[PDB]
């Protein structure tokens, strides 16, 4: 049940993650505790990851499972990566960064490991 809109519900190791990745304070407090909306559309194996920022810049990155996708972050990073699925879980491969998206009881939880820190973000499914 990836298709749908997701809104910030909970998170774990936020500060730890940002402190490790070396995220600037200006962006950290800017992108924290904010209602990020992730709109997902089911297109075969191509899942659209749309990140909406309240009163700020938006980011939209679509990816096809087992296909290289063009991605961009909110910090202004242009890059590409390959995304695959492991048992209904969307996993992306990155250098010292591991992102996995899955559904836990009707909730979307993205796990991002970086430099040892495991960042989790639970988003509820709404329409
Ligand atoms: C919200 C800010 C961008 C704020 C912004 O640019 N506002 C308008 C402006 O000042 O131009 C973005 C930039 C870096 C983004 C973070 C980085 O991408 C790291 C990490 C990425 C995860 O997908 C979401 C959480 C997390 C931690 C992001 C939260 C949102 C951040 C902090
Ligand atoms: C790993 C980067 C964040 C790297 C970082 O440190 N950013 C800080 C900054 O914004 O400067 C995040 C931001 C965009 C995220 C990708 C986009 O959300 C698109 C896609 C979403 C899927 O749920 C997971 C794979 C995939 C491809 C995500 C993997 C993790 C990415 C690529």
């Amino acid at each position: 049940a990836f298709t749908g809109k997701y809104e910030f519900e909970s998170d774990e190791n936020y500060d730890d993650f940002v402190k490790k990745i070396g995220l600037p304070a200006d962006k950290i407090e800017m992108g924290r505790n904010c209602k990020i909306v992730t709109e997902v559309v089911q297109n075969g194996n191509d899942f659209t990851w749309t990140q909406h920022f309240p009163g700020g810049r938006t980011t939209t990155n679509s990816f096809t499972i087992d296909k290289e996708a063009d991605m961009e972050t909110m910090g202004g990073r242009k890059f590409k990566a390959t995304v695959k699925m492991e048992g209904g879980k969307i996993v992306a491969d990155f250098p010292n960064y591991h992102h996995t998206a899955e559904i836990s009881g009707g909730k979307l939880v993205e796990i991002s490991t970086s430099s040892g820190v495991v960042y989790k973000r639970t988003s509820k499914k709404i329409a």
Side-chain angles (χ1 to χ4, degrees):
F2 285 115
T3 322
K5 109 192 289 243
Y6 292 113
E7 277 167 41
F8 210 110
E9 187 96 306
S10 292
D11 82 86
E12 164 191 303
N13 278 330
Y14 191 108
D15 300 85
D16 238 282
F17 186 77
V18 298
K19 277 295 106 196
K20 287 291 263 182
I21 58 164
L23 197 65
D26 292 69
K27 297 297 185 189
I28 291 176
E29 313 290 72
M30 179 73 252
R32 82 175 308 146
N33 235 268
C34 33
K35 39 176 160 186
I36 308 301
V37 190
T38 301
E39 304 234 278
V40 181
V41 178
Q42 179 86 34
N43 179 40
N45 254 211
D46 184 67
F47 291 82
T48 63
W49 233 241
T50 316
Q51 275 70 80
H52 291 293
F53 203 47
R57 64 97 107 222
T58 194
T59 350
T60 314
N61 322 279
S62 298
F63 54 87
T64 294
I65 305 300
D66 201 26
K67 166 71 197 187
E68 177 212 280
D70 322 301
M71 306 154 196
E72 162 187 335
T73 69
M74 281 186 167
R77 311 180 103 99
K78 310 290 185 160
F79 61 94
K80 283 129 152 309
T82 330
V83 183
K84 53 206 169 177
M85 245 183 199
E86 44 168 71
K89 313 163 58 200
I90 318 205
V91 54
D93 168 63
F94 287 96
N96 208 342
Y97 201 117
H98 206 67
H99 197 101
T100 53
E102 57 205 78
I103 302 297
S104 34
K107 272 165 169 169
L108 182 275
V109 50
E110 306 179 90
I111 298 101
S112 324
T113 340
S114 199
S115 319
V117 172
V118 179
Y119 165 58
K120 289 158 188 153
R121 29 150 53 195
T122 315
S123 312
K124 59 178 163 278
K125 216 306 261 176
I126 344 88

